[PDB]
Write an enzyme that holds these catalytic residues in place. Structure first.
Site, short mmCIF file in Angstrom:
data_model
loop_
_atom_site.label_atom_id
_atom_site.label_comp_id
_atom_site.label_asym_id
_atom_site.label_seq_id
_atom_site.Cartn_x
_atom_site.Cartn_y
_atom_site.Cartn_z
CB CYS B 51 -0.94 -0.28 1.00
SG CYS B 51 -1.65 1.80 0.85
CB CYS B 56 -3.28 2.33 -0.55
SG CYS B 56 -3.09 1.01 0.19
CE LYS B 59 -5.58 4.03 -4.97
NZ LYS B 59 -6.54 2.89 -5.22
CE1 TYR B 191 -8.26 -2.79 -6.09
CE2 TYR B 191 -7.71 -0.96 -6.08
CZ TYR B 191 -7.53 -2.31 -5.61
OH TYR B 191 -6.74 -3.08 -4.68
CD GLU B 195 -7.94 2.42 -7.75
OE1 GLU B 195 -8.43 2.91 -7.42
OE2 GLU B 195 -6.86 1.76 -8.05
CG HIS B 458 -28.59 22.13 0.80
ND1 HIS B 458 -28.96 20.99 -0.38
CD2 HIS B 458 -29.27 23.29 -0.13
CE1 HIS B 458 -29.46 22.26 -1.36
NE2 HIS B 458 -29.46 23.33 -1.29
CD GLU B 463 -28.77 17.55 -0.22
OE1 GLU B 463 -29.76 18.11 0.73
OE2 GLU B 463 -27.56 19.25 -0.57
C1 LIG Z 1 -2.35 -0.51 -7.09
C2 LIG Z 1 -2.65 -1.03 -6.18
C3 LIG Z 1 -3.41 -0.05 -5.62
C4 LIG Z 1 -4.32 -0.82 -4.13
N1 LIG Z 1 -5.17 0.67 -3.80
C5 LIG Z 1 -5.64 0.50 -2.66
C6 LIG Z 1 -6.68 0.86 -2.04
O1 LIG Z 1 -6.71 2.33 -2.81
N2 LIG Z 1 -7.02 0.87 -0.99
C7 LIG Z 1 -6.83 0.22 -0.35
O2 LIG Z 1 -7.42 -0.65 1.58
N3 LIG Z 1 -6.01 -0.87 -0.80
C8 LIG Z 1 -5.04 -0.85 -1.59
N4 LIG Z 1 -4.23 -1.73 -2.31
C9 LIG Z 1 -4.36 -2.99 -1.69
C10 LIG Z 1 -3.70 -2.92 -0.59
O3 LIG Z 1 -1.77 -2.36 -0.96
C11 LIG Z 1 -3.13 -4.21 0.01
O4 LIG Z 1 -4.51 -4.86 0.48
C12 LIG Z 1 -2.37 -4.60 0.82
O5 LIG Z 1 -1.26 -4.05 0.81
C13 LIG Z 1 -2.22 -6.19 1.43
O6 LIG Z 1 -1.60 -6.66 2.81
P1 LIG Z 1 -0.55 -7.61 2.86
O7 LIG Z 1 0.05 -7.46 4.39
O8 LIG Z 1 -1.22 -8.46 2.87
O9 LIG Z 1 0.27 -7.47 1.60
P2 LIG Z 1 1.57 -6.55 1.74
O10 LIG Z 1 1.55 -4.83 1.44
O11 LIG Z 1 1.97 -6.79 -0.06
O12 LIG Z 1 3.33 -6.77 2.05
C14 LIG Z 1 3.61 -8.25 2.08
C15 LIG Z 1 5.41 -8.25 2.60
O13 LIG Z 1 6.28 -8.93 2.39
C16 LIG Z 1 7.07 -9.29 1.48
N5 LIG Z 1 7.48 -11.14 1.20
C17 LIG Z 1 7.10 -11.74 1.19
N6 LIG Z 1 7.15 -12.29 1.05
C18 LIG Z 1 8.50 -12.96 1.90
C19 LIG Z 1 9.12 -13.70 2.03
N7 LIG Z 1 8.72 -15.03 1.93
N8 LIG Z 1 10.44 -13.63 3.29
C20 LIG Z 1 10.25 -11.80 3.64
N9 LIG Z 1 9.06 -11.12 3.09
C21 LIG Z 1 8.18 -11.51 2.04
C22 LIG Z 1 6.59 -8.81 0.64
O14 LIG Z 1 7.80 -7.85 -0.15
C23 LIG Z 1 6.08 -7.10 0.83
O15 LIG Z 1 6.88 -6.61 1.77
C24 LIG Z 1 -3.73 -1.52 -3.40
C25 LIG Z 1 -2.93 -2.43 -4.50
C26 LIG Z 1 -2.29 -2.09 -5.47
C27 LIG Z 1 -1.01 -2.84 -5.66
#
Ligand SMILES: Cc1cc2nc3c(=O)[nH]c(=O)nc-3n(C[C@H](O)[C@H](O)[C@H](O)COP(=O)(O)OP(=O)(O)OC[C@H]3O[C@@H](n4cnc5c(N)ncnc54)[C@H](O)[C@@H]3O)c2cc1C
Ligand SMILES: Cc1cc2nc3c(=O)[nH]c(=O)nc-3n(C[C@H](O)[C@H](O)[C@H](O)COP(=O)(O)OP(=O)(O)OC[C@H]3O[C@@H](n4cnc5c(N)ncnc54)[C@H](O)[C@@H]3O)c2cc1C
Lengths: 473, 477, 473, 477
Positions: B51, B56, B59, B191, B195, B458, B463
């Protein structure tokens, strides 16, 4: 058998809603509307009342004009090659605003015609509990009805001070002002005064806000002072604990205002191009001749029961004119409509006036719904109130380094048990858009548990309500 | 006996929330985070997950840059003497967004150091159900824990087509792209693709959206097509029922994309400066060596129960990586926090994944909470659903004469009984701001009667939700 | 027996320090100084060299003028009733700056007289290793000496492009410009170009910075790009990877500059009031006739040993003109003085050119001492480098919401063992004042342990160095 | 066995640093903080202690407001068309400083909640050496701990004279004063009194400084008198060798102060709007009931050893409250952090209270580190001390023709051998910025040779330290 089933006195937010709904429900109705021109400038406008002509609508458009100037500056920070050295053409802005309003007037007048509301452009006054005198530009009429609904609203007040009428203006004049406001003294720190000072600063003018006692009387005073401070941050001077004494016109054409500190007695003066009185609004009871109908008043207002009835069985009142209820457009509209439904549609639904949300459209906006912190504490005891609060940062503000000093929100709640939310308060961008849904949540019995466990939408500023955690206690 | 009470694998929205809350509840915890650079370009970034760095946040900031361009045009209609003929400096914008992100990255490093979460910048994989191999640039560590929380999220997918990886990019690259995107093919109508296409058009570039099947799969399809139509109105072409076949680089440096209509079979081609794959995100299960820990997977995802447990009792998973739950940041945050509370805080509270609000930040935004109209009809039957709807006009659109063609909202509700609201849908300005409070209202049991009798503020667009008098079935009565 | 013990060629920072110290130590000395007027404008100045006349001194004063305009705006945020709609009188500012410089010139000329330094206002060129020809406005002289010290410095370069000399200016002309700069193209992103663009923006002009390749070549590139970004944040356009092709004067009087993108080849043009070349400075070797004395050069510069001796035993060189050493005033002054002490005061102390601190006086200033991060990594290996860094907030910035985006500092250190500090870098207010003391600490063997355990002075921005904690690794 | 491993009594600079570091090292900790309102006025404030709420921070911001007024005047000399005739809005200034403070207060609440420090907003007093009574508005608690850290700091003193408490104020009230200070008597010539007098004059008010004995006791007296002289130059009168006898309120609301010359015995009087007592700060030992815990005191302070231990082995004290150490925020912070590390982190590192740098933020600032000239002479003998000194001119002072009369600096050093620097003293602009790096240089063993051969940064004022060629004894040679 009278001329009409219903005569509505006043063609504004409440009057028109009531009249249209009554006809929909088979009543034969007339609606009187008249707009007494402003003293001095003779400013006048069409049907539809305060909000569309000289209220919410022009105010919001000027606020938007100001916000757009800020947006041009912000665009440059985001990388746009825009030249941000910009200035508005007041006459062009006014023309655009008035062209909208006049067009809406025309649509409203034709719409009233279509729905079979007989619109009478005359000032109505009581002859009898069943008889009304209408004074039209051409002549008088005299008309009768089984029932009356009074929906007359109010008008800006003037201070009882020399020069006030000849030299000052009100919100009625501001939204169509022929010349630029320039350096303006805004007397009054309620929402109308602050909103006007706000957009005038944003359009490159020089407003000063003079405050008799407190800022935004009737609003949470912590929030009121954050709003004031955010305005001072924007370079708007505040003259605190100060009242005007006189206005006089210099050979200059400029207006010399003498004023006084109410605590110390210290007297001072300054010169302005424009003096705007925003000191309150007075109910238009006088012209009605209410004694001829036997209707009880209570200073400039009309007291009514839970069904909007006066002390006279067939006479009702609705909108701003009623005693002790929120003076807002959607309140007037819904009250007017529900009244017509009880009268002609066989309904029993009464207006709900509790927990009505509002927004103050200052440069940084403030919206709230429910109790102020001080009211909740007075009512329930400090020991059974919990306040969750926070300073937050809109995602968009970091790049342009837009001030986050006054980006603040709070939730006022019951401390234990169900932890019912009593009040919500937010200062920041699009405050009305943020608070609206939460006002519906409050009507649905919103608790702290439900609020904090609602998943936020990210990235927004509204999501800040769902992740409050710091309590004042 | 073990090195840690808890090892969290992944340092994004879910993992950081879980790790911080676990330490607050007395656990000794390590959190691993490592960012694999993009293939081609080699784009990489700091701590805090998708994010903050490539999701997020960037974006939203690009969307804001686009909205500010519109604002400049609108300022002129309101009488400002602004020179309307404008163009963004892409390098300046990219570097401003980067400064925003890097500042957050630093705050996150401080927060971790301050809060006793041991941050390991290495790639984790299972040795067994209590033992993790951590690969760091400085040398590997083998570490043990009582419990593991898998929070690895996903990465952008590439199509299995010639030229895809060499010549194409994904959202991971877009936000810090070294040079202007120019004429851009956006493959994907979820999305993310929509976007990106929206803000590219707004910044003066020329996107086309290629759609394999449907637009915004998983969203209300009436609303999805209104969004698509609003983008077409803005000069964003769509290539419907179309899939890419290859990308190649021309002598003039442009990218030739050949593609196929899936219905007709007809093949065509066009040239672009940039080809953006936005076709979905694949869970990062592969690098974990889950079979070493005995953890069951379901295609790139990890199935878990209502307590986020895998089939292995001391191993949990949370965030995007779990099967079949909303892939959003606040979901990841709250789910990770609640998981830590169940593990170390004596809590029984499970994450509530129902009626989670979301916003699509297209040029005209779309936000919704609760059921789509079709999902409500499927669940309760058409004869038990009522839909209240209408068009509206933002007060701000009048003077600039901005299109109100797609300013539309609806409430999907129970027809009889208490008329419980099932879903709310809005296309218009500041959609996420509008919908948020209503999402809380839905959680509080919002009915039609409560909604329609809530007094409007308003003049606002929110609203309009309080004055929805017309039904699809019966109109006014 | 020659006319003089010592002839110093050049009357600037190095030359004057050396000449005064030599006389103090009993030598009979002459010092030649001549200022060749600028081509086109014919701008000229008095004795004392680059820094006092057309360098550090006028640059710092204009930077201060710009900072004072910012301060007026900030004053309003703190509650001062100042009208912040302000504009500088360029002619008044220039007059004030020049009146200072001219007065200093007069004091310097009289001081040289007092100390028995024979000041000869003529251009010197070698006849023999022991003989110099001086060309004075009146006539020539011919003078002899046992030893020579060459301290000739350099001058701004012009690009080899049509219109560059006729229409462009350099820093030599800027600090006394007869008319307002207006819209100006600043070609060159070294410290001179950036400083000039910075103060021109602050004085309400419209500078653009054109960058051939990189910003602040020779400085830490992370820091260089934070400086650039902070300037773009202030509304200064940067034209990256771009070189000028030509300048021509329109019938307008405006200057049409054609330019080219070096990566793409894309050609463009824009109109400016002023074109400032800040593309480097060329050593003044040519006029000296160095072959007549047998002195080895190395393109525009003179290579010397650790004692500042050329390849000719009795000929020395010092200041900007020497090959491969920092081109700064305090370096020139101390080197000039120590040289005179080895020649005439029996000293053996050699100049120490290592870890010389510097400050770039951009709108948000940047100062550093010691190694860049990239140089430390190249030299010692990434695995034995640790970098401590932070974004910080000056106490004073919150009220006016002054940008903290680029308030950043770092310490580059040895990873293990003694953890010797290799380099310190700070962008923010009063950067030179912050870094100076730390430069003395580095010369005293500063380690990370000593740095972090030094108690901070609160509230300052310098204290940020003593509480670094976050490492890039 | 006890409720907590650690209870910290006091939530200011030392207490918060200690409590946060203790939790980071595995301790279960409570921190009590309570602010007693001022007597008369009833001024009170939030969490975080003296520096944030009523000390360094608001003082620095008022100083900045004063310096910005000077800047406006200077802008005109540099050719700006600014209207020089200016006056501050005291209410606007006070409320801006308050917003700054309240924002910090909130961040501090977040930091505590996030970091497992249990914040108790109540007044603590000892029951016995393991038991504390905590008085909260909501009702008392009795709590136990293995160890206590006393970090209660102090409060402003009042003179024992008629009218002192009724009519006078202290620094606790000044920073949020409801109305303009106006003509102000400042009683006290320590850094607090001098700083307040400086900014009051700069904001257009009219301070007088009343001095009982000496100015800036504990600082180099040559420098102290240069500071006093610089303030006189600025129109700030001093009443030397003078003490107050009473304050009374006149019918016209003004305050009549009667006072006495301590040398002559002559009594006089004057009228003021505000009377500010800045005569010292008294340690808050009384409310603690230290005899209940068996802890030894030494007049309003707590004597401790090099490990901050009191005479009672499980009870420690840190910050202003300890006897005979510098009363400064960064001292409190580092000492509290190190104490927690010795208690819970296995550390042996003791706080270094030697050569702590300080700045007096008078109109022309004074900063110093190490020994005063007189202290160096006392310790080593005059014949073993060398003093390098001079006057200088800031480049910024030339155009406005600002006074350089008091722009003075000196280095006090070992005369022979390695010529170790003992102390550095500077009066001029941004004094704390100048001195900081030199304080680190002193810690690194800075000698005269190293100092004078450090190349200056030009043009700055800090570069003057690197070119100190003239001695008090021998000048140039
Ligand atoms: C372009 C885009 C726009 C988005 N816009 C929105 C939005 O506006 N609103 C919203 O709510 N959500 C948005 N999201 C979705 C949101 O970013 C994700 O839901 C959220 O980041 C998920 O969190 P997470 O902890 O599951 O994974 P992540 O945030 O992906 O974190 C996982 C981390 O673990 C690391 N990792 C993976 N495997 C290993 C490993 N084996 N060892 C060590 N590290 C590892 C990865 O590199 C990463 O840093 C968007 C996503 C994208 C791609
Ligand atoms: C006007 C002024 C200006 C200053 N300027 C500077 C400066 O510029 N630079 C600098 O370094 N220092 C400055 N200081 C000094 C600095 O503020 C102190 O050194 C620092 O605050 C001491 O920290 P502390 O933790 O010992 O005490 P405090 O910060 O005083 O914290 C003690 C806390 O404990 C509370 N408390 C006391 N007793 C109890 C009890 N029994 N139960 C519960 N709570 C209790 C107190 O109310 C207070 O909140 C200034 C001080 C003043 C007053």
């Amino acid at each position: 058998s009278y001329d009409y089933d219903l005569i509505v006195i006043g063609g504004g937010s409440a009057g028109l809603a009531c009249a249209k709904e009554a006809v929909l429900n088979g009543a034969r109705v007339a609606c009187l509307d008249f707009v007494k021109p402003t003293p001095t400038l003779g400013t006048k406008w069409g049907v539809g009342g305060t909000c569309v002509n000289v209220g919410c609508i022009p105010k919001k458009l000027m606020h938007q004009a100001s916000l757009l100037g800020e947006a041009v500056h912000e665009a440059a920070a985001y990388g746009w090659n825009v030249d941000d050295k910009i200035k508005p053409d007041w006459h062009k802005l006014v023309q655009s605003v008035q062209n909208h309003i006049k067009s809406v007037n025309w649509v409203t007048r034709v719409d009233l015609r279509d729905k079979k509301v007989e619109y009478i452009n005359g000032l109505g006054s009581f002859v009898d509990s069943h008889t009304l005198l209408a004074k039209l530009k051409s002549g008088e009429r005299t008309i009768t009805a089984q029932t009356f609904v009074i929906a007359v609203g109010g008008r800006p007040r003037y201070p009882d001070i020399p020069g006030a009428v000849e030299y000052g203006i009100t919100s009625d004049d501001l939204f169509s002002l022929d010349r630029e406001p320039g350096k303006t003294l805004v007397v009054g720190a309620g929402y109308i005064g602050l909103e006007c000072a706000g957009f005038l600063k944003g359009l490159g003018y020089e407003p000063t806000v003079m405050v008799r006692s407190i800022v935004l009387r009737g609003f949470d005073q912590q929030m009121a002072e954050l709003v004031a401070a955010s305005m001072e941050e924007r370079g708007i001077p505040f003259l605190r604990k100060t009242v005007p004494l006189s206005v006089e016109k210099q050979d200059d054409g400029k207006l010399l205002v003498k004023y006084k500190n109410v605590e110390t007695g210290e007297e001072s003066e300054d010169v302005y191009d424009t003096v705007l009185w925003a000191i309150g609004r007075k109910g238009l009871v006088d012209d009605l001749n209410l004694p001829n109908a036997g209707v009880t008043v209570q200073k400039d207002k009309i007291p009514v029961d839970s069904q909007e009835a006066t002390n006279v069985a067939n006479i009702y009142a609705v909108g701003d004119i009623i005693y002790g209820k929120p003076e807002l457009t959607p309140v007037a509209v819904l009250a007017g409509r529900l009244l017509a439904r009880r009268l002609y549609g066989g309904s029993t639904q009464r207006m709900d006036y509790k927990d009505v949300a509002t927004t103050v459209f200052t440069p940084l906006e403030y919206a709230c719904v429910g109790l102020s912190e001080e009211d909740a504490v007075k009512q329930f005891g400090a020991d059974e109130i919990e306040v969750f609060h926070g300073y937050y940062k809109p995602t968009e503000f970091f790049i342009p380094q837009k001030s986050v000093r006054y980006c603040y929100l709070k939730a006022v709640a019951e401390r234990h048990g169900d932890q019912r939310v009593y009040g919500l308060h937010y200062i920041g961008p699009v405050a009305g858009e943020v608070i609206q849904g939460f006002a519906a949540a409050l009507k649905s019995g919103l608790t702290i548990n439900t609020l904090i466990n609602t998943v936020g939408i990210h990235p927004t500023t509204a999501e800040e309500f769902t992740r409050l955690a710091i309590t004042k206690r």
